[PDB]
Paper text:
DHS catalyzes the NAD+-dependent transfer of the 4-aminobutyl moiety from the polyamine spermidine to a specific lysine residue in eukaryotic translation factor 5A (eIF5A). This reaction is the first step in the biosynthesis of hypusine in eIF5A. In eukaryotic cells, mature eIF5A is required for translation elongation and termination, and essential for cell viability. Most eukaryotic DHS proteins are functional homotetrameric enzymes.
We thus determined the crystal structure of full-length, recombinant BmDHS (residues 1–366) bound to cofactor NAD+ to a resolution of 2.3 Å. The interface area for protomers contributing residues to the same active site was quite extensive and totaled ~2,500 Å2. NAD+ molecules occupied three out of the four active sites of the tetramer (see below). Likewise, in the BmDHS crystal structure, the entrance to the two active sites formed by protomers A1 and A2 were blocked by the N-terminal helices (α1, the “ball”) from protomers B1 and B2. Thus, one of the active sites formed by protomers B1 and B2 was open to the solvent. Within BmDHS active site, the NAD+ molecule was oriented in such a manner that its adenine ring was accommodated by protein residues at the bottom of the funnel, whereas the cofactor nicotinamide ring pointed towards the active site entrance (approximately 15 Å to Phe244 phenyl ring). Although present in the crystallization cocktail, no electron density was observed for the DHS inhibitor GC7 in our BmDHS crystals. In our BmDHS crystal structure, the entrance to the active site was blocked by the N-terminal helix (α1, the “ball”), and that might have prevented the binding of GC7 to BmDHS in the crystallization cocktail. In BmDHS, this conserved lysine residue is Lys326.
Numbering used by the authors:
A (entry chain B): 29 to 361
B (entry chain C): 10 to 361
C (entry chain A): 6 to 246, 252 to 360
D (entry chain D): 15 to 360
């Protein structure tokens, strides 16, 4: 049994030791330390040799690893500075699959055109609207950002519609997001690195946002394009079924959390699971449900020892990356 | 010491406006009158005041919706759908269909009190599956490994036995075979709303929200229809002969155009997630909704769209500045049945 | 290949399920096609699930307390504090936070105390003050988003979406100072030892207003315990004003009340000292027999406020045989409806 | 297109661009945490809280006008800024105890308000340890084994039995000193005594007593100490704890302060008591909240700092920061960036 004792600053300011001793601190600090162990286990197994097919069918030529890591995050996380932390993960090819919402895709792309700014939660809606300043928490995203996005996007959508009509090509969210990653051609973009490293980005509700607004506007031109979500479901589910092992790292809740968990039901559950969300169990929401709820469904395995950290991900994810993904890249070099 | 302290704590205060509401709860010495009790939630404060404000907002929507208005009295989708003076968008999450609030939503749809529904895959499937088999009251603290061994799925303190889903598969596969045939032969493009209309027609059960939505030409939009048991069925089904394509772009055109062509719009959002953003985003197209009630447990501090206040939506133009949006911070199972008692149900009773 | 993918997946997703017990409750909400019947609607909260089910379980627990409380029992039918207090078969401890008294809930608590349906109260300094201050002047409905600097310049104090004008406190000072002069005199001349409960009994007698919880608590010999009574306006007045408030005597009084009880029920609206103090008193008798918690706190931060009732069972503050119930909700939304289905129904039945 | 493509005003030239820390630059924790300011949401609040506490600490070291001594404790010395630190009992049950102890040990805070549990668990940890358990452990099973649960932490019941053995003799002396010397006990006086008696450099209460930092607890009877006080009163009547004298001490400390700063971990009486003391001097100058409380229920616990401004408990010119978080996650890191950096600098 582990004795409760925090870090003693009489020993000096050692961040690595401080965060190790989160294990003996208790409450969510202990969950932080358990989450570091779970992710380091995923990253370790992922570098091991394994039996069978070393290729995955989607995308074409995607290599398989001992452990398939599914990374899920909400749109607000991309809107915040956590985007740089997620980009680092995808850039260094440390995750195999992404699930995010329309917001998670567009804000990442829009940031390559124009920045977002620190505001406050208590700014008045009518005053902000008069000035075309959109509020996401304490973050300002000027509406000119979206105007620039429209200018950038329509020519790409014209090409996509042409490829649909001429080549009988069936667009899915993941195929479209792969394309927008290739087009943005920016080493600061998560979507760019996902395209480069053949990490598919699935977004069943991709119409729910600016990309939606543009697709809607684009349709008047010549009828528009079609986005099939059934094919994309085949892709994510098959990836899980064909995996040697799976880990899930879910930041936030909503569709992203359920989709990744559902895909892992197809293989009778994930082997490793970290949740980093602020949701609560009392309302009966999937968002606030505990990892042990997912075990009842068979979406997380019984031998797995899932960890959930109840915290804002902007506070804890950058520190998780410091202790896991970043340490792993530093060790390899 | 005492003189400095008195200056800070003894400060004189301005006169309050003459219209100001006095805080006074319901006095049970007057007897048990539920209508009076819930009216006096207005002078109770905190969320109780928000409950009373929400009753007023929904009753305003329902009142305006009965009125005459100028212009086109038809909406393009579904075909031949009549337009009212206010278009009411009802949004709910999957767990609210897994709860008994399903019966409250069904009553609204059956009585043609709302014009448009947005819900998730769960919100559709659970409603259909409840016509085949029941869900049961369990507890939140039931062990996952033990429940899994027994094929008992847990959703909060509710048990959905996995045989319910096996039955769903038996029921759904033949319908998907017909849908695929209609896609191949008639060059028909399926969307979530078109598929949910079809499943409503097939279930043919007066206990189903989806049945009444079909019957009353109330479209159900679900952009992420593949996220659930329906997706699982869709997955398995694709191996039989290739499968069905579900286009989300056409369904976006339908909901956005419904908003753009509305005389007025009200939004009633139970929960957060895609449902909330999708309805709010459709109303951006007309420069915001005229009336808005949120009933969710989300918090602002994490910056999530889910936990955001209605005034955030005003900044984007998804809710009008004129609008006086109300959020109740509560579990919908506690407050929504009582909202229906004071709003929708009162309206049907008054009419009949 | 394709065939193996779909057949592996079907095995995981199509698992057969065990039979549910025959007494299992089917999830079914209230059907408004049956008409608007609030009593039936709230009964069927039991089969609605999530917190609605907890509401229905809480109604049953409180109705059990009120039922047992009317029964005959064995032994001493008197409690030592206050002097000449009648013991019932169940002692009900009511706890509530200051904000609840700030809200319209106060009228619901006053009704309970007025009709002598609870035996003991624990609240904070605010819970005592606001109730007294509402006899002198009213509180108004404002909004959560009102600016602090603007409100301060106007002497308007904000408590959630409720406004308490600072003149209310000035009036309180005028009213309280003469009472504190008398109390101090009684301390000096009669060697009297003041406790929070003794002082709150006195302020109840002085306010002499049938709208006041504290007035009815005094009248019905329902003790009000407030260990941190210095934490507020009463504190401010005691600061400006030579009286000693002993909290050790008051602790003996609440603990002995628990130890000498035939049965105990706890009804806790909120969290904080109120919750910990009532739960601690019941540890002395190896736990309460019935317990309803109505609060918004969460477990994850390890707070006493957010702890679930099962955690208390670990301490022995709540009994193993008890079936405690917690509703995760704002009390202003649920407490008046609990009173409609429990305390009010009970008074109507008699 | 008219509604969705509306043109936007230019942002001020000083506006902060949202950019998180790039791990391509390597693992630098000081740079990472500086970059929380541009990160957004709570991360931004973390960075603003570091600035507020560093302002308090920096100001505290400077010279100021007037009396340089405080009345309570008698030998207490006043500083340019008086820092009031508040914490709930669960943070003392956690390893954050070691972080609080470091603050008090290095005389970096002047006043302390906590609950009975915040005092008890600090002393009991010098007698026997607490262990890491889980939130989901069954109450009946734990009770059968005499294991008390606080969140995911186990406090074996023998810990409290040892406490009782340690505390009763001390209480006997306190009662003797009340009867013979006509001494009036307050919570702060009793907690000072317990700190002296524990005589253990791991204890917050030990360092508080040694550095003349007072610990106020208006509801010091609410817990194991109260239980001991209850049993002990049956011998010869027991001790008397006056809360009015202790109110005079904390209020006067604030009223005589050149400047005041508040650091509140959690809510409850601790938060209101410190805020109320500062109301006497027309509010605190600097304020950091770390709690998980929400505004919606109207509780004082979940109230934003701007509510406290309406009452005059926090000043208008102050720029209060709340971090919405479990303090076990953020407080150790706040100490790394503020209090520890300060001790390292001097
Ligand atoms: N405003 C925007 O940024 C924006 C932009 C365009 C589209 N959208 C759309 O809005 C919809 C709703 O967003 P969503 O579904 O991605 O998420 P959401 O807002 O529904 O959040 C899901 C849940 O995740 C948790 N969570 C969120 N942020 C967290 C954080 N920082 N730390 C910890 N937990 C956190 C919360 O419990 C929350 O309820 C999406 O469909 C998206 O496409 C949003
Ligand atoms: N657990 C299930 O019931 C279940 C089963 C099948 C499908 N799904 C899928 O899970 C995904 C995510 O679920 P979702 O988006 O429908 O909801 P969700 O669980 O993500 O809830 C989103 C937010 O709604 C609010 N909320 C939830 N329940 C509430 C209540 N009772 N009262 C008030 N507010 C409440 C909360 O703020 C919560 O963060 C969906 O794509 C859905 O199809 C879930
Ligand atoms: N701002 C005020 O209203 C005010 C005024 C004067 C005195 N005070 C003092 O503030 C201190 C703190 O207040 P407290 O200890 O009474 O409670 P609190 O404000 O600390 O509330 C504690 C917990 O109770 C729960 N809760 C509160 N209100 C609720 C509600 N309406 N519904 C459901 N759950 C609810 C929440 O989980 C909260 O975290 C006390 O010492 C009190 O005397 C407050
Ligand atoms: Cl095509």
């Amino acid at each position: 049994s582990t004795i409760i004792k925090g870090y003693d600053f009489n020993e000096g300011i050692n961040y690595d030791a401080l965060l190790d001793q989160y294990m003996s601190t208790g409450f969510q600090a202990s969950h932080f330390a358990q989450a570091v162990q779970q992710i380091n286990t995923m990253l370790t197994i992922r570098e091991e040799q394994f039996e069978g097919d070393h290729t995955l069918p989607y995308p074409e030529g995607k290599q398989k690893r001992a452990c398939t890591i599914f990374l899920g995050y909400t749109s607000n996380l991309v809107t915040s500075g956590v985007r740089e932390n997620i980009r680092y993960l995808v850039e260094h090819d440390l995750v195999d699959c992404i699930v995010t919402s329309a917001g998670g895709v567009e804000e990442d792309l829009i940031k390559c055109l124009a920045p977002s700014y620190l505001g406050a939660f208590d700014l008045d809606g009518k005053t902000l609207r008069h000035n075309g300043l959109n509020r996401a928490g304490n973050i300002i995203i000027p509406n000119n950002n979206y105007c620039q996005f429209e200018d950038w996007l329509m020519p790409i959508l014209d090409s996509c519609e042409l490829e649909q009509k001429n080549n009988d090509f069936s667009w899915t969210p993941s195929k479209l997001i792969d394309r927008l990653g290739a087009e943005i051609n920016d080493k600061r973009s998560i979507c760019y690195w996902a395209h480069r490293n053949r990490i598919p980005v699935f977004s069943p509700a991709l119409t729910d946002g600016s990309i939606g607004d543009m697709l809607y506007f684009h349709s008047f031109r010549n009828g528009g394009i079609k986005l099939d979500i059934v094919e994309d479901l085949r892709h994510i589910n098959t990836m899980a079924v064909r995996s040697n092992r799976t880990g899930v790292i879910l930041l936030g809740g909503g569709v992203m959390k359920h989709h990744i968990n559902n895909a892992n039901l197809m293989r009778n559950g994930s082997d490793y699971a970290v949740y980093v969300n602020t949701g609560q169990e009392f309302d009966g929401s999937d968002s606030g449900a505990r990892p042990d709820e997912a075990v009842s469904w068979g979406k997380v395995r019984s031998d797995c020892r899932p960890v959930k950290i109840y915290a804002d991900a902007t506070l804890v994810f950058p520190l998780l990356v410091a202790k896991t993904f970043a340490r792993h890249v530093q060790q390899k070099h």
